Design a protein around this motif. Structure first.
Motif, PDB file in Angstrom:
ATOM      1  N   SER A   1       9.651  54.730  43.584  1.00 21.16           N
ATOM      2  CA  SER A   1       9.718  56.018  42.902  1.00 21.16           C
ATOM      3  C   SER A   1       8.496  56.182  42.004  1.00 21.16           C
ATOM      4  CB  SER A   1      11.003  56.109  42.083  1.00 21.16           C
ATOM      5  OG  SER A   1      11.083  55.024  41.179  1.00 21.16           O
TER       6      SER A   1
ATOM      7  N   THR B   1      14.637  51.514  51.208  1.00 21.22           N
ATOM      8  CA  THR B   1      13.855  52.598  51.798  1.00 21.22           C
ATOM      9  C   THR B   1      12.385  52.277  51.768  1.00 21.22           C
ATOM     10  OG1 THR B   1      13.302  53.916  49.809  1.00 21.22           O
ATOM     11  CG2 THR B   1      15.459  54.236  50.799  1.00 21.22           C
ATOM     12  N   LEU B   2      12.040  51.213  51.037  1.00 18.74           N
ATOM     13  CA  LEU B   2      10.650  50.746  50.832  1.00 18.74           C
ATOM     14  C   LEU B   2       9.731  51.807  50.247  1.00 18.74           C
ATOM     15  CD1 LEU B   2       9.939  48.751  54.148  1.00 18.74           C
ATOM     16  CD2 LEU B   2      11.249  47.919  52.238  1.00 18.74           C
ATOM     17  N   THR B   3      10.292  52.775  49.545  1.00 23.97           N
ATOM     18  CA  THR B   3       9.460  53.783  48.926  1.00 23.97           C
ATOM     19  C   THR B   3       9.620  53.762  47.420  1.00 23.97           C
ATOM     20  OG1 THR B   3       9.818  55.133  50.875  1.00 23.97           O
ATOM     21  CG2 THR B   3       8.859  56.216  48.944  1.00 23.97           C
TER      22      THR B   3
ATOM     23  N   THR C   1       9.627  53.233  58.888  1.00 21.05           N
ATOM     24  CA  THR C   1      10.531  52.469  58.031  1.00 21.05           C
ATOM     25  C   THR C   1      11.474  51.638  58.885  1.00 21.05           C
ATOM     26  OG1 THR C   1      10.371  54.235  56.384  1.00 21.05           O
ATOM     27  CG2 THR C   1      12.077  52.611  56.038  1.00 21.05           C
TER      28      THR C   1
ATOM     29  N   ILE D   1      11.517  42.564  49.458  1.00 22.18           N
ATOM     30  CA  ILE D   1      12.514  43.487  50.008  1.00 22.18           C
ATOM     31  C   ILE D   1      12.559  43.248  51.509  1.00 22.18           C
ATOM     32  CG2 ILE D   1      13.307  45.859  50.321  1.00 22.18           C
ATOM     33  CD1 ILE D   1      11.361  46.381  47.810  1.00 22.18           C
TER      34      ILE D   1
ATOM     35  N   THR E   1       6.301  60.967  49.315  1.00 22.56           N
ATOM     36  CA  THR E   1       7.131  60.179  50.203  1.00 22.56           C
ATOM     37  C   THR E   1       6.334  59.078  50.851  1.00 22.56           C
ATOM     38  OG1 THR E   1       6.997  61.300  52.389  1.00 22.56           O
ATOM     39  CG2 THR E   1       8.404  62.293  50.727  1.00 22.56           C
ATOM     40  N   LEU E   2       5.024  59.069  50.609  1.00 22.36           N
ATOM     41  CA  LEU E   2       4.091  58.101  51.209  1.00 22.36           C
ATOM     42  C   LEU E   2       4.233  57.984  52.734  1.00 22.36           C
ATOM     43  CD1 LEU E   2       4.542  55.225  48.547  1.00 22.36           C
ATOM     44  CD2 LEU E   2       3.005  57.142  48.394  1.00 22.36           C
TER      45      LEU E   2
END
Ligand code: NO2
Ligand code: NO2
Ligand code: NO2
Ligand code: CU
Ligand code: CU
Ligand code: CU
Ligand code: CU
Ligand code: CU
Ligand code: CU
Lengths: 335, 335, 335
Positions: free
Chosen positions: C209, C205-207, A207, A302, B205-206
């Motif tokens: 949900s 966070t690029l994650t 990340t 993003i 959480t990938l």
């Protein structure tokens, strides 16, 4: 045999410019001689003063773009000043053998070496610093750029018809992994080796804290925006040594795009967004047809507008009401 | 009509080898018969002893690679021993109908079943486990492999010219999601079911804890490295059932590459790095021109060198000075 | 000259349906007139009652698909009702100039505007609310769709042979970043504005949900599943305005697939899994050859089965044993 071809020397320019070069050339196979000097340095990477303990070629992210033609030979002198902390080397993705050159270029601080390889394959190719099977770090800290190996005959479309750009630009996209303290602010390190353990740890999370074009958030905006004009044809060279990205030109297109960046394959046309694979460099040609300020970005928005992977292109010329016109300006909704 | 045709029996080999097969063939449609046995087991996945509660085809990651030709019929007997805990099935991405076989191969522990399908389209295709409810898990815990369906006449370049490889290698890249303790070390589970809940949480959480070629870190290194020699042409089959990857050969290229892995389409030449989409398998040919030790990796280098998506190829032969020469070794910088 | 061409009005339909249209047409260039009304609304996005403070074109995720032909002019009236609390604009990836129309469509609540552009390039193109250089909140909140610009002649295989579909369906994949509380449960926001700060933070966070097709988990399943029958040919339009996806049809394929979504380019055949780049829209063609329930999904299976990126097609017709037959049903392993 190669020791007897005419040796020439190229003066390199720092990005986003590409050193002047011929596309289609009358000329024959040459050996092109280049010099790059590694510079380890602390750079300010965003507008709130966050710093990266960086590692660059020639003191810029990305390193400068090297242009040659298919069948030329590339001859590089890699310089590692005594003022640096670490060893370095270089892997040319365009080269064939001994880890792209990395085995033959291990220069310690205060050393230099000279490698030559044949540029037997055409396209944009990443070159980047090398790890002996080790947790990257050098790469993500800034050590990459593009080698462009043009076809001797110029760029060709799928039907074999020739294509010419008026000017080429180079963009390096770097995913940065800046550590954070317990206070939640980014850490500022006195030396390079100090930053290591904390950085490695951020890298595992896959990340990026920032993702920047050419070394800095907003590096290609405002006073430093790219420039072109209506009627002009630009070649956008996009390198990403470590991570996938998805370039896009806002209100533009990719007229002819080699997203895998290998010129021998037929380019694709009309693309809205294309895909540079992590550890590759692609190219796209666009002929501007409208004036104004375009944005050029990674279209994970993003990543673009929150993490930093975006720049601008300022375009001179005449507005074309056919292609697009404002029929009705924003006005109140009919009573 | 199918039953009429000759039924032949292949005995599969474990990865990274591919079972002996004919490329271009003079034979006609056969029904090729395979057997795979699902082995549930705990496996050591890294150098520091971390374990995975794995699920596998024939006790390996990946499953072995099944090779047939366009127009052949694939006949798989799937065995799920009474010693396993979970039900299994198989989805061939190469097959047509009923979720790729999955709806017809639902074997409980102590059951077996036999599925036939027509291999009517050519390419490398992923096959993976696919039960009701809990598909990713069975998949990420190790249950995928590659079916290679070779076009009847061998592999063809974009011009129609014939292409031939000397040996083929199969690499399955696995994104692993190993849970951690409150003390920060990896958890070790007594049984497969105990691993479930904790694993799913990491999955959301990938972010893989590890990413390995063929079952563990350094599985294709040192003694287990792939082998080749100058002038040899290899086919590197790369499968990834769940997650994107971007294969690269260090100081190599893809001479011809079907990154989407479907042979009816024209390959691409000179690729530095290609891209395997999650849930697909692709293929690349390269003919070596230099000796030495090459690295084959996912060119997200964090994923490669930190999480484990890397292997080596040891290449025998004679150094070609034309392609690359160390002009001047690392010496001190002149005054 | 545009103002002197016939002006036609199209009524838009809600996804997954695409408004009635002609593929190959004898008609001359027209100005095709559309109306879209922005609707900000709170939506339930999963089975467990989680809500999104959404923003939409026409009260749906994605916005409706707009169909025209290469050479036509798109004329959209964008309506931003006084019932909304945010400004909006629109960027058409298929338009040339002024951030894709964004710079001329900035409508504050209670305003509307009208934009014309020449659909000079053929393919599926994303359109989305333009974030004029800011964190893409409106985009991830639901403001995107597809514009399909069909070639005037119909769709063409790589050989120039004509291709035709019986129905077209449009799937918009949305990666959501719903915030969580200190208690670990998803937040619920009274107003849309209250959702901003927390969301932007998740985005960083690029994650995601959740990752949902068409506006909620299972939106295209059960009563709402896509429907087809054996011998039917469907176009599957897949858009992802912000993040990469990899569509796959289970026990199905992509017969012809424009994964970059630009029709003037040769499609690819026999794809198991294709790749829509974030900020693009791709199209795939398939002709059903088997009945039963199919799943259409992102082949990152964690993203499909855990985060929500999957739907179903129900297919009528007659089982074909030549393609696939169950030789032995699941039964006890013999001695
Ligand atoms: O086209 N980028 O919003
Ligand atoms: O260092 N990977 O070419
Ligand atoms: O083919 N998706 O399980
Ligand atoms: Cu270095
Ligand atoms: Cu590399
Ligand atoms: Cu299984
Ligand atoms: Cu699958
Ligand atoms: Cu908006
Ligand atoms: Cu966009």
């Amino acid at each position: 045999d190669a020791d007897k071809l005419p040796h020439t020397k190229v003066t390199l320019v720092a990005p986003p410019q590409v050193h002047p070069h011929e596309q289609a050339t009358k000329s024959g196979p040459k050996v092109v001689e280049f010099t790059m000097t590694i510079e380890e340095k602390k750079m300010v990477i965003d507008d709130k003063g966050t710093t990266l303990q960086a590692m660059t070629f020639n003191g810029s992210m990305p390193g400068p773009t090297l242009v040659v033609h298919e069948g030329d030979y590339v001859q590089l002198t890699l310089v590692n000043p005594a003022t640096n902390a670490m060893p370095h080397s270089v892997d040319f993705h365009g080269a064939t053998g001994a880890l792209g050159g990395a085995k033959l270029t291990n220069v310690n601080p205060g050393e230099q070496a000279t490698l030559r390889f044949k540029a037997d394959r055409s396209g944009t190719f990443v070159y980047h610093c090398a790890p002996e099977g080790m947790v990257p770090w050098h790469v993500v800290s800034g050590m990459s750029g593009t080698l462009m190996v043009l076809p001797r005959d110029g760029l060709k479309d799928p039907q074999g018809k020739p294509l010419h750009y008026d000017r080429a630009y180079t963009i390096g996209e770097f995913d940065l992994y800046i550590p954070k303290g317990p206070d939640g602010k980014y850490k500022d390190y006195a030396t390079l080796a100090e930053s290591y353990g904390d950085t490695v740890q951020v890298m595992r999370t896959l990340t990026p804290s920032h993702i920047v074009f050419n070394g800095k958030v907003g590096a290609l905006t405002g006073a430093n925006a790219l420039t072109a004009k209506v009627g002009e044809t630009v070649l956008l060279i996009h390198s990403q040594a470590n991570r996938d990205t998805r370039p896009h030109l806002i209100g533009g297109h990719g007229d002819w795009v080699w997203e895998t960046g290998k010129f021998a394959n037929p380019p694709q046309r009309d693309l809205e967004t294309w895909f540079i694979r992590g550890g590759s460099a692609g190219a796209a040609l666009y002929t501007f047809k409208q004036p104004g300020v375009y944005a050029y970005l990674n279209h994970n928005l993003i990543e673009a507008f929150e993490l930093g992977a975006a720049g601008h292109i300022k375009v001179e010329g005449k507005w074309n009401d056919d292609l697009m016109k404002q029929i009705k300006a924003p006005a109140p909704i009919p009573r």
